Write a structure and sequence with these properties.
The structure is a homodimer. Chain A is mainly β. Chain A folds into 3 domains: 219 residues, Beta-galactosidase, Chain A, domain 5; 128 residues, no CATH class; 116 residues, Immunoglobulin-like, CATH 2.60.40. Chain A has 4 helices and 34 strands. In chain A, the strands form 7 sheets. The first copy, chain A, has a 9-stranded mixed sheet. In chain A, a hairpin with a 4-residue loop joins β31 and β32. The first copy, chain A, is elongated. Chains A, B: Pathway: Glycan metabolism; osmoregulated periplasmic glucan (OPG) biosynthesis.
């Protein structure tokens, strides 16, 4: 009912055609300035603008389990996005032109007369609500350049995902692709899923995106198919990028001066390689910008996970980090050779998303190149696929050089060493204990001296604790790999960790006594 | 059967007589050197000496729920302690002379011929076992100068208590009273409780101690009655001292570079004043030695508590800090004016007991003075008496100067401030919330700016969070008192905290960016 634009035929092939035509032509450029009312507005004024639930998308669909509400122009959202409604039966799309009557400005200093003849103006994005609460809490949100977020049955929006990433870690500056348009298929009566088509535009790449989002009871499953058309040479391309935050946690705690024991939207990076090996990579908050590439030939799955769901580990009631979802990327086709990038930015608090994970194809991207990637996104804790063997539970790092449970109190340890504790749960650990669980530790630098295997009754797991001794002053990052091998065969997933030793002068403890 | 000494009449009045006679005479002095085998022995050799369970005390008592095994001379235990067995029916005590046949040395380099004619040699102490395991795990242990420890139904020996404390915090050195002798009443068949009489001797004080220890299903209750006779002038006297450990926890974490999130045998000091006010004093690990005296007129109860029983907060499998008991002291009579001392020593790990709490009578101790104190000791988590009002759950301290849940990530907070978060649970907090919970915060120095009251669903409690601003450069310790007052009346127990601000030059955050 809110779609008043001209009727035009639309399809996925049609969407690919305009994306190809857009790549063949010059870039539109930076967004033009917004009207003076929106351009100069208070952040509190923008938050007072509420979309009209009576004028929401699919409001005339009887017995509906979904509802869509659009956002408003303003703040950092300067790119106008056009929304269309397309009938699934007859492939005709009608443009939903922006009108001031679609919003209630309330306590906003908007004149509303400058937005009267502003049909060219669009929206900042959209959010989708579920059946029990069709206008209160959204399960799927598409806000920003290309960022989109979804929630599990606990709601509590956590990490975000984008449609593309360009030059994430290169000598050049970051380029942010924009979702310039959206096509919404009309939701069927009593339908959990819905389909939305997105047109991605950027200064060096254009793409056609198709999203099939299923809002299940305990998870949100998104089927993403894209067709990228390169406009210029791209030195770094990221497929299905993941944006999250990691400030502190069960890791090296160099930022722990806060009332919250752990602050992170995600604590680990789990990878399912083509050969079938599961890799656990805990996230880090390094002092310097870090980029890590993990070579893969056909990744069966990867993503950032929030495996710590206990509230007492976070002690946050405004963010609810324990209720935040975990994102898992499941490719549908063979993606070929490439690397899973992982960029970690230093951070102080929780207002900056410093974790970026994406898939980078091995082949260099040139002008006129074409790409097609299909993958499934799972937005929930406890991702659908996990390692059948023993799984890493936590990665605790601390002082070493002393017997466990007998840390000296009158003095610091004489020899400086770093102690790493890794907890393994699941698999056949209790069966392999009588035969002998032998941990295999590979270190780029240094040596592991006090390798101990201990059993933890409350978690029904085994802890592998070792002390790392530098034996060098190169201060270069140290790569560690751990996996449990009982009968000459792996019984646990690989534990991948990047450790940054302190300076040689800082490899000691100062004591006032 | 193991008592072969001469029969002598013994009673509590008789024990008080020899304590009075001992005070009237000069001190025995430092213990004489042990035989060469025990004097020069390996720590591993001493641990190889095992007492004979067949020759244990009360071995001839049919249908017994208790068993007593003695310790051996060696290591820091250089004071010989004489053990006696006294029949409750006929008050006759027989001395249990030390014999080499009472121990199995096994892997010990002890000649055993030098200990043949060594009846004058005694024991380092004794331990008491319960009915299900009469020779494996002890519930009550008396090892050391005057230290004695007891366990709850989780076992896992934690904090210790002594019979007396002399000059705990004074310009002079520490003086350790010694339990020079022990009288054991024969345990009745099928009796949970047992009575042991102790003679305390020291360079400046002598005392007669009577212990009535009940080993209940979930707790150990000790009835302690003492009669102290001062031999010299004592400048500081401690009644029912408590010795514990506090390295890290939900507090100022200046020692947190370890795999264990919290290391402490006790986290708070709970006091029940004569007027009926409950005070919660979280323990601290200060950089410098600290002594605090809390004036009381008739203390109804005090002790060190371990209220955090969750394993995930400690992550220790060798110490099991979550299973350690809490000690509560319940005076039986009016103790009069005095102060509850609390000495905190700086510590690095967990091998040093740096928390000492004791009751100091107001009146100065002179030569020839007489004292008599009766109190009950409870050795279990969740002490029998707690505040009927709201109780403090945790005391989290961290960075301030920013809105909660929106800590800046690209930069540090502009203004330095310390944020204190106190969680209150129980009482009538949910009923007083509609009326308005007003927190009353008293600060010796500085001001509280951002006082916020928030509700925590998972713990069903309310968090009082405030930011402390220095407004001074005196770097002196800051005393804070908090209690919730809704209708002009207190609805929560008082929260007492001692905070040490950093140096004025250190009241800032350094950023590499």
């Amino acid at each position: 009912d809110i779609a008043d634009g001209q009727t035009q035929r639309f399809d996925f092939s049609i969407l690919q055609s305009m994306a190809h035509d857009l790549a063949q032509t010059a870039w539109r450029g930076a967004p033009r300035p917004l009207p003076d009312t929106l351009a100069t507005m208070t952040p509190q004024a923008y938050n007072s603008i509420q979309y009209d639930a009576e004028k929401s998308l699919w409001h005339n669909v009887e017995n509906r389990q979904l509802d869509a509400q659009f956002f408003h122009m303003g703040m950092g959202f300067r790119r106008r996005v056009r929304m269309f409604s397309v009938d699934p039966a007859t492939h005709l799309a009608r443009e939903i032109h922006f009108r001031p009557e679609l919003f209630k400005y309330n306590d906003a200093g908007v004149d509303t007369k400058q937005l009267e003849g502003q049909s060219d103006l669009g929206f900042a994005g959209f959010r989708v609500f579920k059946a029990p609460e069709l206008a209160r809490r959204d399960v799927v949100s598409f806000l920003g350049a290309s960022y989109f977020r979804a929630v599990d049955d606990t709601y509590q929006y956590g990490l975000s995902a984008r449609g593309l990433a360009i030059d994430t870690y290169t000598d050049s500056k970051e380029e942010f692709p924009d979702f310039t348009a959206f096509w919404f298929d009309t939701v069927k009566p009593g339908a959990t899923t819905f389909t939305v088509y997105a047109l991605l535009d950027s200064a060096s790449i254009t793409g056609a995106y198709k999203f099939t989002i299923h809002c299940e009871k305990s998870q949100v499953i998104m089927d993403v198919e894209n067709h990228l058309y390169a406009r210029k040479d791209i030195k770094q391309l990221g497929i299905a990028p993941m944006t999250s935050m990691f400030s502190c946690g069960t890791n090296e705690r160099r930022m722990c001066d806060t009332i919250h024991p752990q602050i992170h939207d995600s604590d680990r990076l789990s990878m399912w390689r083509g050969n079938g090996e599961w890799i656990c990579r805990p996230l880090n908050n390094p002092q310097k910008l870090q980029f890590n590439a993990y070579t893969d030939n056909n990744p069966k799955g990867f993503g950032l996970l929030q495996l710590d769901r206990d509230f007492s580990h976070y002690q946050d009631i405004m963010g609810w980090y324990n209720k935040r979802p975990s994102l898992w990327v499941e490719p549908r086709n063979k993606w070929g050779k490439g690397t899973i990038g992982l960029m970690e930015i230093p951070t102080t608090g929780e207002t900056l998303d410093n974790i970026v994970c994406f898939w980078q194809p091995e082949k260099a991207v040139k002008a006129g190149d074409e790409f097609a990637f299909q993958y499934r996104l799972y937005w929930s804790a406890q991702p659908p696929v996990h390692c059948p063997l023993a799984r890493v539970m936590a990665t605790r790092t601390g002082m070493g050089g002393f017997s466990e449970g007998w840390a000296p109190g009158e003095h610091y340890p004489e020899k400086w060493a770093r102690r790493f504790a890794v907890d393994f749960v699941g698999g056949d650990l209790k069966a392999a204990a009588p035969k002998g669980i032998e941990p295999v530790i590979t270190l780029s630098s240094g040596e592991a001296k006090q390798i101990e295997i201990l059993y933890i009754e409350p978690i029904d797991g085994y802890r592998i604790q070792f002390d790392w001794y530098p034996t060098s002053d190169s201060t270069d990052p140290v790569d560690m790999r751990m996996y449990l091998r009982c009968q000459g065969d792996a019984i646990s997933e690989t534990w991948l960790y990047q450790y940054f030793p302190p300076a040689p002068d800082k490899r000691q403890y100062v004591d006032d006594r």
